[PDB]
Design a protein around this ligand. Structure first.
Ligand SMILES: NC(=O)C1=CN([C@@H]2O[C@H](COP(=O)(O)OP(=O)(O)OC[C@H]3O[C@@H](n4cnc5c(N)ncnc54)[C@H](OP(=O)(O)O)[C@@H]3O)[C@@H](O)[C@H]2O)C=CC1
Ligand SMILES: CCc1nc(N)nc(N)c1C#CCc1cc(-c2ccccc2)ccc1OC
Length: 157
């Protein structure tokens, strides 16, 4: 199963200056609950923003740099390599990888941030004619999670 894992705002902003424009623990909980014990495929630039690999999951980084070597990280150099990965594979970002993979994924796990932030990286546009809403769940708001958000699970028609 090949799925996109993304969090974008009302205008599909995903990042600003190599990082997330918001901190939302509920979305992090959503990521860990969903990707733990599976595989994350991310672009090279996104990994450098994180620094370390994420624990309890297989971390794959896509890069043209063949000399790439980081502790506890598997390396791939082509978009084709993704299909030769066992189990549930999550496309983790960022922009350029989302742009390439949107047309190829079966599945899509989107956290819609119900706001408008300043950003320089975006998620590709998508119509609901191509995607059916498998589930739409509102996020609960506490003192630590003050930005309204909706968890969407989208499956390709
Ligand atoms: N809100 C969210 O869900 C997320 C947001 N983001 C945000 O997005 C931004 C990152 O976007 P972006 O700058 O596009 O970063 P990316 O991680 O998507 O960059 C991808 C990089 O990997 C390499 N690469 C990508 N595709 C290929 C390919 N097909 N073949 C060979 N190499 C490839 C390229 O560099 P090279 O080959 O030279 O190494 C490229 O620069 C950040 O600002 C971040 O904050 C990121 C993830 C999630
Ligand atoms: C965590 C939001 C996020 N949510 C969703 N629904 N999909 C995603 N693909 C990402 C993402 C990302 C990429 C990303 C993640 C973390 C992070 C922070 C704390 C703990 C674990 C990871 C830090 C920087 C970063 O790049 C800027």
């Amino acid at each position: 199963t090949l799925s996109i894992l993304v969090a974008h705002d009302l205008q599909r902003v995903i990042g600003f200056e190599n990082q997330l424009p918001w901190h939302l623990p509920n979305d992090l909980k959503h990521v860990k609950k969903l990707s733990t014990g599976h595989t994350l495929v991310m672009g090279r630039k996104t990994f450098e923003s994180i620094g370390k690999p994420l624990p309890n999951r297989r971390n794959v980084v896509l890069t043209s740099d063949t000399s790439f070597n980081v502790e506890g990280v598997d390396v791939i150099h082509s978009i084709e390599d993704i299909y030769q990965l066992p189990g549930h594979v999550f496309i983790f970002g960022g922009q350029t990888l989302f742009e390439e993979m949107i047309d190829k994924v079966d599945d899509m796990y989107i956290t819609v941030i119900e706001g408008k932030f300043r950003g320089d990286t975006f998620f590709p546009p998508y119509t609901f004619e191509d995607w059916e809403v498998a589930s739409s769940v509102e996020g609960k708001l506490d003192e630590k999670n003050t930005i309204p958000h909706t968890f969407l699970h989208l499956i390709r028609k």
